[PDB]
Amino acid sequence: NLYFQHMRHFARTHAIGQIVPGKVTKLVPFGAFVRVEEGIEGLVHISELAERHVEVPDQVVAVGDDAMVKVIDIDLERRRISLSLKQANEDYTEEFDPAKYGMADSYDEQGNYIFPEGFDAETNEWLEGFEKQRAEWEARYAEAERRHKMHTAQMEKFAAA
Ligand SMILES: O=C(O)c1cnccn1
Numbered sequence: 001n002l003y004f005q006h007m008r009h010f011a012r013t014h015a016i017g018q019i020v021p022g023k024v025t026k027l028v029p030f031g032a033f034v035r036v037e038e039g040i041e042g043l044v045h046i047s048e049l050a051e052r053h054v055e056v057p058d059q060v061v062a063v064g065d066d067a068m069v070k071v072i073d074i075d076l077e078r079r080r081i082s083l084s085l086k087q088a089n090e091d092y093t094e095e096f097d098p099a100k101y102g103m104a105d106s107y108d109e110q111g112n113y114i115f116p117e118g119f120d121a122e123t124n125e126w127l128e129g130f131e132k133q134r135a136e137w138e139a140r141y142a143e144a145e146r147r148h149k150m151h152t153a154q155m156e157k158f159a160a161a
């Protein structure tokens with residue numbers, strides 16, 4: 001079963017709560033399907049489109065719209081990924097929280113930051129011979145930033161209210 005395997009891979013590479021970019025692919029009476037990271041599709045249920053009540057999804061999104069959504073549930077049995085636009089926006093903060101955009105593994109159970117393998121907290125510099133790890137990290141971070149920036153844009157485009 002390839003689909004299960006893909007969705008499982010997805011679940012194991014994304015934390016619940018993660019906020020991710022998506023493209024709206026399809027509208028239905030009960031919500032809007034969104035393709036996540038040019039990957040696979042989740043559902044934004046109609047009640048999770050916005051804070052206000054909504055009679056049809058078109059009231060909030062349209063096919064082809066880009067958006068940042070929160071992953072709120074992953075059901076590998078029913079092979080549904082649940083998404084929320086509403087909650088993504090509820091959790092937005094002008095201040096950047098990398099945990100919510102792809103770097104949750106840089107935080108422990110308390111929420112304390114974990115200095116990555118190869119970075120010297122004392123020296124505050126990357127250790128020579130770790131260029132691979134520096135690269136991967138810098139990349140992950142950049143993406144997390146991009147994502148937050150986009151979300152900011154989405155919130156700014158809330159000049160609707
Ligand atoms: O048609 C479906 O699969 C469906 C309908 N309502 C809620 C969730 N899923």
Ligand SMILES: O=C(O)c1cnccn1
Pocket residue numbers: 026033041080
């Ligand atoms: O049956 C589903 O859950 C479905 C439908 N359209 C797109 C993605 N998923």
